[PDB]
Amino acid sequence: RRGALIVLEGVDRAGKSTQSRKLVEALCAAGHRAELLRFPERSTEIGKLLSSYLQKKSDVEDHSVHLLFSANRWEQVPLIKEKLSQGVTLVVDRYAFSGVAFTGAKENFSLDWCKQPDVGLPKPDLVLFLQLQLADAAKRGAFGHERYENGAFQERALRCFHQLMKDTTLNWKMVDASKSIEAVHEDIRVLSEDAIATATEKPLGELWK
Amino acid sequence: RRGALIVLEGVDRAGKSTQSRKLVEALCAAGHRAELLRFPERSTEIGKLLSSYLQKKSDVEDHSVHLLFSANRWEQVPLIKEKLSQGVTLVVDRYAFSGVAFTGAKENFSLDWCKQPDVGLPKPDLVLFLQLQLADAAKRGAFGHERYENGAFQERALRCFHQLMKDTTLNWKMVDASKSIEAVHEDIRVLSEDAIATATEKPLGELWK
Ligand SMILES: Nc1ncnc2c1ncn2[C@@H]1O[C@H](COP(=O)(O)OP(=O)(O)NP(=O)(O)O)[C@@H](O)[C@H]1O
Ligand SMILES: Nc1ncnc2c1ncn2[C@@H]1O[C@H](COP(=O)(O)OP(=O)(O)NP(=O)(O)O)[C@@H](O)[C@H]1O
Ligand SMILES: Cc1cn([C@H]2C[C@H](N=[N+]=[N-])[C@@H](COP(=O)(O)O)O2)c(=O)[nH]c1=O
Ligand SMILES: Cc1cn([C@H]2C[C@H](N=[N+]=[N-])[C@@H](COP(=O)(O)O)O2)c(=O)[nH]c1=O
Ligand SMILES: [Mg+2]
Ligand SMILES: [Mg+2]
Ligand SMILES: [Mg+2]
């Protein structure tokens, strides 16, 4: 009985990382075999290149960096498939959608070009999108010092995310991330249990194909 | 007056590297500003990952390695555009065509997926394809120890190259690489001078778009 592939995407400071950690914890506490993944996965060779870029310690040509972000997902695909086939549900903090939305926020990057490298990746069974109004995100401290951490760029990324959500091949669920950490968590947890229960029914799909 | 972008592609041991070096030398000797490039460009961070893979010192997931080969071209695009805009002709030993042909020789890699990462790269003004019958390539010593250096895989790559050559958006020229080094060189040199003279007329194109 395979595991589910659940991705969390969402606006700046909406709580992707907090909710992904809490979700894995709660699923395991409820008897599921679930494990957390995140992209970028900064531990691999490619992941280090990406981390340096995001910290502004290095500059990387925009197309090159886009392909490295995708390659960083592909190198984890054998693991993702193995775990899911072993019945382990994977909760993933960001995935190909952030890949497309952030590069697509740059000038002269079509959504189509941005999607292609990720075509064929394991298709998520559930894509949660954590929505939060900017006034509310602002109360969540201040921007970080990493690349892309500024309102105007975030806004362009958000427009890209909205285009991706028009894709009905994907099980997108909107989450109101303005509530408390615990309230948001319960919303996510229940959506997740439902997905886990239905994923054991159809084979793992391929993204964007 | 911009430089031309000339790529050399071709079968195993057909003489891509020998002819690219000789071409640059001859162009410079004839008053052109020309410089040699090669892919993979093994000197960069990404290039080292690729070199390790090709030497079989490391294993890389097939999709990841494909995207690294493309990223290795993109990271050189600012240089390529700068040089061409300065009037420097660039002679390139392998390019996106080898990228597509070698990954596309693997099982379950469509030509379409393989092309996408490279869509938008500087379009070559001239693509030379060095053709050589296997009996003739065999007289050119023995296979190397690197990955992909075996007859069956080379044959599949060759079929992919033939599909790419159906693309009329590109100025493909076939070269009979069975002749002597000097004879092949003269054929290439003359094709190249012609291209250099016409490239100063239309802007640099974008590949596969
Ligand atoms: N529902 C919430 N209410 C209030 N604060 C929250 C909530 N969720 C997260 N936070 C806090 O806001 C900050 C951002 O949380 P985090 O889960 O790291 O966001 P994120 O969505 O991963 N942001 P980023 O990865 O930078 O886009 C952290 O200090 C969290 O404790
Ligand atoms: N026309 C030719 N006649 C005879 N030997 C040749 C010719 N061209 C190249 N060679 C030799 O064959 C070997 C392969 O040449 P080289 O130019 O390195 O090929 P290549 O096309 O780059 N092969 P590879 O990069 O391995 O696909 C070298 O020893 C060359 O000296
Ligand atoms: C997974 C992924 C993330 N990103 C971005 C989103 C984030 N930048 N911001 N803001 C950054 C990762 O931030 P975190 O490491 O905090 O998740 O990289 C890409 O640009 N492409 C990708 O493929
Ligand atoms: C440029 C490029 C080369 N290649 C291959 C062709 C070659 N393998 N063989 N045989 C190898 C480079 O060989 P040379 O370094 O000798 O040119 O990488 C790819 O697989 N993808 C690419 O994008
Ligand atoms: Mg986070
Ligand atoms: Mg397409
Ligand atoms: Mg060579």
Nearest to A101 by CA among A206, A8, A6, A10: A10
The dihedral formed by the CA atoms of B77, B78, B84 and B86, expressed in degrees to the nearest 10? -170
Beta strands in chain B (DSSP E): 5-10, 34-38, 89-93, 126-131, 172-176
Interface check B181 vs A, CB under 8 A: no
Q: Say if residues A173 and A129 touch (Cβ distance below 8 Å).
A: yes
Q: Say if residues B20 and B36 touch (Cβ distance below 8 Å).
A: yes
The two tokens of residue A129 are 């999108």
Q: How was this structure determined?
A: X-ray
For B178-199, letters b (16+ CB in 10 Å) and e give beeeeebbebbbebbbebbeeb
Nearest by CB to residue B67, choosing from A61, A113, A117, is A117
Task: Find which of A44, A48, A60, A63 to mutate to test the B interface (most B CBs within 10 Å of its CB).
Answer: A63
Ramachandran sector of residue A159 (left: φ over 0; alpha: ψ -120 to 50; beta: rest): alpha
User: What are the beta bridge partners of residue A172?
Assistant: A127
**Inter-chain contact B116–A119, Cβ cutoff 8 Å?**
yes
User: What are the beta bridge partners of residue B131?
Assistant: B176
- Domain CATH for A68: 3.40.50.300
Q: Which residues are CB-neighbours of B148 under 8 A, at least 6 positions away?
A: B54, B102, B105, B154, B157
Interface check A103 vs B, CB under 8 A: no
Q: Classify residue B118 as exposed, middle or buried by CB count within 10 Å of its CB (0-12, 13-18, 19+).
A: buried
Give the number of the ligand closest to the Cα of residue A66.
3
- Pick out the residues of the known binding site of B for ATP: 13-18, 94, 179, 189
Interface check A60 vs B, CB under 8 A: yes
Range of the domain at A94: 1-209
The two tokens of residue B24 are 């640059």
Q: Say if residues A53 and A65 touch (Cβ distance below 8 Å).
A: yes
Number of domains in chain A: 1
Q: How far apart are CA B7 and CA A69, in angstroms?
A: 28
